Amino acid sequence: HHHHVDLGTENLYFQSMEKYVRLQKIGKAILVKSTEDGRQYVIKEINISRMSSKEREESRREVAVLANMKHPNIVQYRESFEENGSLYIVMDYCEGGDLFKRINAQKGVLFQEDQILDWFVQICLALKHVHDRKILHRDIKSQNIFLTKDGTVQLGDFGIARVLNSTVELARACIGTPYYLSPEICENKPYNNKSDIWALGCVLYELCTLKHAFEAGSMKNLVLKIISGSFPPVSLHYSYDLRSLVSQLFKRNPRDRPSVNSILEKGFIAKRIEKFLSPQLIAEEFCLKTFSKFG
Amino acid sequence: HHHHTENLYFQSMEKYVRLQKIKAILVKSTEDGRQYVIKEINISRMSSKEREESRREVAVLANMKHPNIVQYRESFEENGSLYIVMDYCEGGDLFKRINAQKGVLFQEDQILDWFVQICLALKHVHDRKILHRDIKSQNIFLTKDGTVQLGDFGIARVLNSTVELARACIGTPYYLSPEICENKPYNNKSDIWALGCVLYELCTLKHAFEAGSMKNLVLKIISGSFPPVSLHYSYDLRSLVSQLFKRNPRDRPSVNSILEKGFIAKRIEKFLSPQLIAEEFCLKTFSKFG
Ligand SMILES: Cc1nc(N)sc1-c1ccnc(Nc2cccc([N+](=O)[O-])c2)n1
Ligand SMILES: Cc1nc(N)sc1-c1ccnc(Nc2cccc([N+](=O)[O-])c2)n1
Ligand SMILES: [Cl-]
Ligand SMILES: [Cl-]
Ligand SMILES: [Cl-]
């Protein structure tokens, strides 16, 4: 080809023949049906063709991490494929929709504490699985937490990250949803596991109040409110344990926020874990495996 | 009955009124107002296998009788649950008794008189090849007259090591043996480790193995390193504590070997009649044959 996008530069990857029919956008995300057996899945599309060499090697690294992750409270990965300059990730469809919608469907009626806590413990178990492996999740949001047909909570897998840039996170938040921005990101400090904990706190607060903790009339004032750490208090009819946990997740200094392992060690949360994980999984993930930044 | 089983069991008409949770429940008989404890086990959501094993466990509980084991009164089944009725020990649990010292150490004679009673109870269970998954200070009680009783609920005919580890990561982890930490088989000597934890609590008013996380607790237990007992306790007692915390199960003494140590043996007569001594130590044989 006498050239001066060369042909044969499109990447092709596939692991199976299964074909999917597009039904609908749902957010990025597409609802599909398999032509094999009519089962529904969600596909996330990422453009690849306009990435550098480096960015493609990092996306490949991210997908391999997604592809190996398995936990009952994380959306289950099915396969991926590449064609036409995009990467596509296929995952299971959660028939109960996202928590964002579930919160709005209350139309102002507050959830019972036992429901808030049963959902919350599941989100914590998922996040433990991610954080134990030293993976950051950039997308702990009520729009990225889903319910299965039997009511099980699943954290969206898409959004995991091996490392995150603070300027880029801040920019993404101006453009998309800003409600989960941590103080440290607002001050251009490193994104860390406690920044995930802040976002977890935002989700918990949404579940307690049906509202975002940090809202304001402008992006710039939203940033100042987040740094000040001042939010409308949760209803006093919720237990002291729950109200106090909300306050701890919103500590201004990351190192004062509890780790997800520490949250799960609080008695009123710990006593629920047994409903959600098998003895084998409890033993393996709380006791027998070792996790470290050393390899 | 055109389509597209609940069992009922009782042994007496006696009715009980719920007073308070203490799934153990404090109840009063409507007959004479005497207090009892009832443990409720849900049965309707068990498999075939699990129900056959629960029934086997309750039959073992129901036939057990010893002055230092909480006395089984009766059981009944209704509404998809099994209920076990036992005596209420008015003095409460040893856990509370230990905390009530508010840092004041027990006299060695008091430690040993309690300890011998726990050992006699555990001998009775172990002689019959029964494991006890719940040798804990929260499951050892004092009667109104000060007699020590090991809680019966918690006996087991076999125990799964993964399940025991899981239960500990969720409930109390302070009694976990090194072998269970390494996911190796639960055995009689694992009960001996837990007996050692109770003895240590009685000697120091603290747990032998504490840590800032479940994961680090596991590492401390395997290392076998614990704060030494006060040197004002006898050499006999301090040396016994060390033997019960041997890392390898087979190096821990059997409960029969513990009862044979002179400073313990001389107390047995206060707690068992001659007939019971002869029967427990000399005459009734048990064997894994079958
Ligand atoms: C991973 C993911 N990203 C989205 N965007 S949606 C989505 C996803 C994944 C699994 N299941 C679902 N279920 C679902 C059902 C109904 C509605 C919505 N929703 O995002 O408004 C989501 N959605
Ligand atoms: C078998 C049993 N399981 C319980 N849980 S409590 C219990 C039991 C059995 C016999 N007697 C008692 N007495 C008692 C009295 C007072 C306080 C407590 N307590 O465990 O806080 C227990 N408790
Ligand atoms: Cl964490
Ligand atoms: Cl051994
Ligand atoms: Cl033994």
mmCIF file of C-alpha atoms in Angstrom, chain A residues 82-248:
data_model
loop_
_atom_site.group_PDB
_atom_site.id
_atom_site.type_symbol
_atom_site.label_atom_id
_atom_site.label_comp_id
_atom_site.label_asym_id
_atom_site.label_seq_id
_atom_site.Cartn_x
_atom_site.Cartn_y
_atom_site.Cartn_z
ATOM 1 C CA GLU A 82 -11.234 -6.133 19.906
ATOM 2 C CA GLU A 83 -12.432 -5.061 16.463
ATOM 3 C CA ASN A 84 -12.972 -1.870 14.447
ATOM 4 C CA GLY A 85 -10.626 0.213 16.666
ATOM 5 C CA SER A 86 -12.412 -0.584 19.909
ATOM 6 C CA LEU A 87 -12.080 -2.881 22.882
ATOM 7 C CA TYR A 88 -15.254 -4.443 24.178
ATOM 8 C CA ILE A 89 -15.747 -5.971 27.619
ATOM 9 C CA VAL A 90 -18.640 -8.360 28.071
ATOM 10 C CA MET A 91 -20.169 -8.805 31.512
ATOM 11 C CA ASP A 92 -23.224 -10.168 33.252
ATOM 12 C CA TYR A 93 -26.393 -8.120 33.217
ATOM 13 C CA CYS A 94 -27.689 -7.205 36.720
ATOM 14 C CA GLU A 95 -31.487 -7.293 36.340
ATOM 15 C CA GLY A 96 -32.266 -5.103 39.367
ATOM 16 C CA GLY A 97 -30.538 -2.032 37.943
ATOM 17 C CA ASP A 98 -28.207 0.439 39.687
ATOM 18 C CA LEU A 99 -28.363 1.791 43.207
ATOM 19 C CA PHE A 100 -28.675 5.337 41.915
ATOM 20 C CA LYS A 101 -32.068 4.480 40.447
ATOM 21 C CA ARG A 102 -33.035 2.449 43.495
ATOM 22 C CA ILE A 103 -32.375 5.469 45.717
ATOM 23 C CA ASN A 104 -34.509 7.753 43.539
ATOM 24 C CA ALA A 105 -37.316 5.191 43.493
ATOM 25 C CA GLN A 106 -37.784 5.752 47.259
ATOM 26 C CA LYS A 107 -39.208 9.180 46.341
ATOM 27 C CA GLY A 108 -37.979 10.610 49.668
ATOM 28 C CA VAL A 109 -38.860 7.602 51.890
ATOM 29 C CA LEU A 110 -35.752 6.719 53.925
ATOM 30 C CA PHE A 111 -34.445 3.160 53.836
ATOM 31 C CA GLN A 112 -34.489 0.982 56.932
ATOM 32 C CA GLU A 113 -31.072 0.754 58.593
ATOM 33 C CA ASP A 114 -30.936 -3.056 58.150
ATOM 34 C CA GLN A 115 -31.346 -2.656 54.383
ATOM 35 C CA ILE A 116 -28.637 0.079 54.257
ATOM 36 C CA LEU A 117 -26.232 -2.121 56.191
ATOM 37 C CA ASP A 118 -26.863 -5.317 54.201
ATOM 38 C CA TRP A 119 -26.133 -3.445 50.963
ATOM 39 C CA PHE A 120 -23.200 -1.635 52.483
ATOM 40 C CA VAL A 121 -21.482 -4.797 53.783
ATOM 41 C CA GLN A 122 -21.613 -6.298 50.266
ATOM 42 C CA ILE A 123 -20.033 -3.172 48.745
ATOM 43 C CA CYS A 124 -17.315 -3.396 51.464
ATOM 44 C CA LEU A 125 -16.644 -7.071 50.682
ATOM 45 C CA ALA A 126 -16.199 -6.267 46.993
ATOM 46 C CA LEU A 127 -13.918 -3.336 47.772
ATOM 47 C CA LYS A 128 -11.883 -5.509 50.151
ATOM 48 C CA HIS A 129 -11.297 -7.968 47.351
ATOM 49 C CA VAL A 130 -9.987 -5.118 45.104
ATOM 50 C CA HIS A 131 -7.951 -3.329 47.795
ATOM 51 C CA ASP A 132 -6.339 -6.519 49.118
ATOM 52 C CA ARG A 133 -4.781 -6.903 45.655
ATOM 53 C CA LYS A 134 -3.574 -3.301 45.783
ATOM 54 C CA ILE A 135 -5.943 -2.165 43.069
ATOM 55 C CA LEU A 136 -7.634 1.259 43.182
ATOM 56 C CA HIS A 137 -11.226 1.600 42.043
ATOM 57 C CA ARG A 138 -11.852 5.008 40.410
ATOM 58 C CA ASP A 139 -15.541 4.428 40.170
ATOM 59 C CA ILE A 140 -17.191 3.670 43.479
ATOM 60 C CA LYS A 141 -20.472 5.407 42.676
ATOM 61 C CA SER A 142 -24.121 4.554 43.169
ATOM 62 C CA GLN A 143 -24.458 4.525 39.353
ATOM 63 C CA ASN A 144 -21.774 1.780 39.236
ATOM 64 C CA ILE A 145 -23.279 -0.498 41.936
ATOM 65 C CA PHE A 146 -25.989 -2.880 40.734
ATOM 66 C CA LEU A 147 -28.554 -5.353 42.064
ATOM 67 C CA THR A 148 -29.052 -8.836 40.687
ATOM 68 C CA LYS A 149 -32.444 -10.477 40.217
ATOM 69 C CA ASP A 150 -32.173 -12.063 43.667
ATOM 70 C CA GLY A 151 -31.158 -8.721 45.306
ATOM 71 C CA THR A 152 -27.396 -9.354 45.579
ATOM 72 C CA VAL A 153 -25.282 -6.190 45.312
ATOM 73 C CA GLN A 154 -22.516 -6.125 42.691
ATOM 74 C CA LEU A 155 -19.842 -3.501 42.339
ATOM 75 C CA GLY A 156 -19.075 -2.626 38.739
ATOM 76 C CA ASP A 157 -15.678 -3.980 37.778
ATOM 77 C CA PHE A 158 -15.013 -1.498 35.058
ATOM 78 C CA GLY A 159 -13.204 1.464 36.627
ATOM 79 C CA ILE A 160 -10.504 -0.448 38.435
ATOM 80 C CA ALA A 161 -7.085 1.156 38.038
ATOM 81 C CA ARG A 162 -3.460 0.220 38.735
ATOM 82 C CA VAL A 163 -2.644 3.931 39.435
ATOM 83 C CA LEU A 164 -4.629 7.224 38.990
ATOM 84 C CA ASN A 165 -3.537 10.856 37.991
ATOM 85 C CA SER A 166 -4.956 13.629 40.221
ATOM 86 C CA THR A 167 -5.370 16.358 37.571
ATOM 87 C CA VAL A 168 -7.115 13.874 35.259
ATOM 88 C CA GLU A 169 -9.424 12.684 38.101
ATOM 89 C CA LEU A 170 -10.317 16.288 38.899
ATOM 90 C CA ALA A 171 -10.996 17.078 35.198
ATOM 91 C CA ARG A 172 -13.139 13.877 34.787
ATOM 92 C CA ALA A 173 -15.203 15.037 37.738
ATOM 93 C CA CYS A 174 -15.879 18.533 36.301
ATOM 94 C CA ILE A 175 -17.126 16.808 33.124
ATOM 95 C CA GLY A 176 -19.024 13.847 34.536
ATOM 96 C CA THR A 177 -20.165 13.334 38.096
ATOM 97 C CA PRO A 178 -18.317 15.432 40.708
ATOM 98 C CA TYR A 179 -20.097 14.130 43.823
ATOM 99 C CA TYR A 180 -17.454 11.561 44.808
ATOM 100 C CA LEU A 181 -14.347 13.810 44.681
ATOM 101 C CA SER A 182 -12.097 13.462 47.731
ATOM 102 C CA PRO A 183 -10.343 16.433 49.390
ATOM 103 C CA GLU A 184 -6.897 15.149 48.436
ATOM 104 C CA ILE A 185 -7.770 15.118 44.748
ATOM 105 C CA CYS A 186 -9.208 18.624 45.130
ATOM 106 C CA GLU A 187 -5.728 19.665 46.387
ATOM 107 C CA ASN A 188 -3.862 17.738 43.703
ATOM 108 C CA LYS A 189 -2.421 15.114 46.075
ATOM 109 C CA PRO A 190 -2.014 11.453 45.172
ATOM 110 C CA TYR A 191 -5.087 9.264 44.703
ATOM 111 C CA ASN A 192 -4.880 6.418 47.211
ATOM 112 C CA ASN A 193 -6.953 3.663 48.734
ATOM 113 C CA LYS A 194 -8.473 6.159 51.221
ATOM 114 C CA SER A 195 -9.800 8.193 48.257
ATOM 115 C CA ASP A 196 -11.848 5.063 47.444
ATOM 116 C CA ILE A 197 -12.974 5.072 51.090
ATOM 117 C CA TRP A 198 -14.195 8.656 50.718
ATOM 118 C CA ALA A 199 -16.267 7.582 47.675
ATOM 119 C CA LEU A 200 -17.593 4.646 49.669
ATOM 120 C CA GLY A 201 -18.663 7.210 52.304
ATOM 121 C CA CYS A 202 -20.498 9.191 49.613
ATOM 122 C CA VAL A 203 -22.419 6.052 48.623
ATOM 123 C CA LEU A 204 -23.215 5.280 52.238
ATOM 124 C CA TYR A 205 -24.433 8.830 52.736
ATOM 125 C CA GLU A 206 -26.694 8.560 49.655
ATOM 126 C CA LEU A 207 -28.139 5.445 51.121
ATOM 127 C CA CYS A 208 -28.758 7.227 54.471
ATOM 128 C CA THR A 209 -30.244 10.463 53.136
ATOM 129 C CA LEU A 210 -31.215 9.823 49.489
ATOM 130 C CA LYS A 211 -29.029 12.860 48.628
ATOM 131 C CA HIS A 212 -25.389 13.673 47.896
ATOM 132 C CA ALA A 213 -23.309 14.796 50.868
ATOM 133 C CA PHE A 214 -21.476 17.535 48.986
ATOM 134 C CA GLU A 215 -23.558 19.663 46.666
ATOM 135 C CA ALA A 216 -23.173 23.298 45.749
ATOM 136 C CA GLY A 217 -24.250 25.902 43.229
ATOM 137 C CA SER A 218 -20.969 25.709 41.282
ATOM 138 C CA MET A 219 -18.121 23.327 40.686
ATOM 139 C CA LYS A 220 -15.659 25.750 42.291
ATOM 140 C CA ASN A 221 -17.756 26.010 45.496
ATOM 141 C CA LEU A 222 -18.345 22.278 45.507
ATOM 142 C CA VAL A 223 -14.539 21.920 45.678
ATOM 143 C CA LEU A 224 -14.386 24.321 48.658
ATOM 144 C CA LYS A 225 -17.209 22.452 50.463
ATOM 145 C CA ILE A 226 -15.454 19.096 49.972
ATOM 146 C CA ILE A 227 -12.159 20.461 51.365
ATOM 147 C CA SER A 228 -14.002 22.005 54.358
ATOM 148 C CA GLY A 229 -15.511 18.553 54.945
ATOM 149 C CA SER A 230 -18.850 20.038 56.034
ATOM 150 C CA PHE A 231 -22.033 18.137 55.090
ATOM 151 C CA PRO A 232 -25.643 18.027 56.330
ATOM 152 C CA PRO A 233 -25.865 15.565 59.241
ATOM 153 C CA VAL A 234 -27.604 12.172 58.766
ATOM 154 C CA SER A 235 -31.046 11.643 60.426
ATOM 155 C CA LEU A 236 -30.683 10.974 64.132
ATOM 156 C CA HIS A 237 -33.056 8.030 63.982
ATOM 157 C CA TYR A 238 -30.143 6.013 62.490
ATOM 158 C CA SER A 239 -27.958 4.259 65.099
ATOM 159 C CA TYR A 240 -24.929 5.882 66.652
ATOM 160 C CA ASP A 241 -22.767 3.146 65.001
ATOM 161 C CA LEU A 242 -23.947 4.097 61.529
ATOM 162 C CA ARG A 243 -23.786 7.853 62.065
ATOM 163 C CA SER A 244 -20.296 7.593 63.513
ATOM 164 C CA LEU A 245 -19.112 5.442 60.540
ATOM 165 C CA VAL A 246 -20.396 8.066 58.115
ATOM 166 C CA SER A 247 -18.309 10.720 59.982
ATOM 167 C CA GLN A 248 -15.160 8.556 59.936
#
